Design a protein around this ligand. Structure first.
Ligand code: MG
Ligand code: MG
Ligand code: MG
Ligand code: MG
Lengths: 84, 88, 88, 84
């Protein structure tokens, strides 16, 4: 795969992860718009800590999911800062 | 009624282009390969991701919000590279 | 280099919103339910799709390119409704 | 499902169908930009004819795929006409 094909595959997975999260009762479908910069930072650090935990437990199956979570929250905070 | 969900792709359409542009800028530099998701080991992709996450944390502590946007692109790319290595 | 693939989502982000807006306009009208993908049979969704495809062909033959855009929204929606019925 | 969730699912499938088509050697990754209105019309009618064939054969498994093809080519022509 070149970058573009990898990125297309990864975006589809990121989106599927977003779907699952927003499907939980009470969850905002637009965290990048609805949350403050501070809350988005806070959330991203939580996700990064979860990724570190998965690495420490050598939980590679869950590692894939945690990489998606981190990528999405990087995107959401980037989005918030890019309007700001 | 507004299709809030389509705002995801409005965001991703921009973010993915910025991630690629960031890959461009660095693919050139010493010790960088055009396909890290394929060329590097899982172990190297990990330590590189952790390095980038450390830089992101450092930007936050310095309150350097300008440079923070770039560090978010780097972390996303390295999540992507390791995800790719792990998924094929 | 340009990320040509992301142009797909730039297009879809607009098109999906227009499809929804078209659903809005017609969900109201007599003999229309808010959830045709759930409320109608496969057979009815089919004949409705075929009806919409016939209207699209009629717009093309009349060279009515303004109204053609609306007929494309209708066909896409009805492909979607039948796909949904078939997929759940 | 409400409209939004259905549409999210359908778009993901439309995109996966697009991926597969563009992966064929020689295929444009941007038919909506690279093709003329006439070629896009021509292509859409071909896809609609294929959908009709699938219905006539009662090939319901292939019917799902043909619905995606038709939706994508409706979108591509709409895109071309919406710039025009
Ligand atoms: Mg997580
Ligand atoms: Mg960095
Ligand atoms: Mg019509
Ligand atoms: Mg076909």
């Amino acid at each position: 795969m070149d970058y573009f094909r990898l990125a297309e595959k990864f975006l589809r997975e990121m989106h599927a992860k977003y779907m699952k999260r927003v499907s939980r009762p009470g969850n905002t479908p637009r965290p990048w718009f609805d949350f403050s910069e501070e809350r988005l930072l806070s959330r991203l650090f939580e996700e990064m800590d979860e990724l570190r935990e998965a690495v420490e437990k050598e939980d590679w199956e869950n590692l894939r999911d945690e990489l998606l979570d981190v990528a999405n929250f990087c995107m959401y905070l980037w989005g918030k800062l890019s309007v700001k």
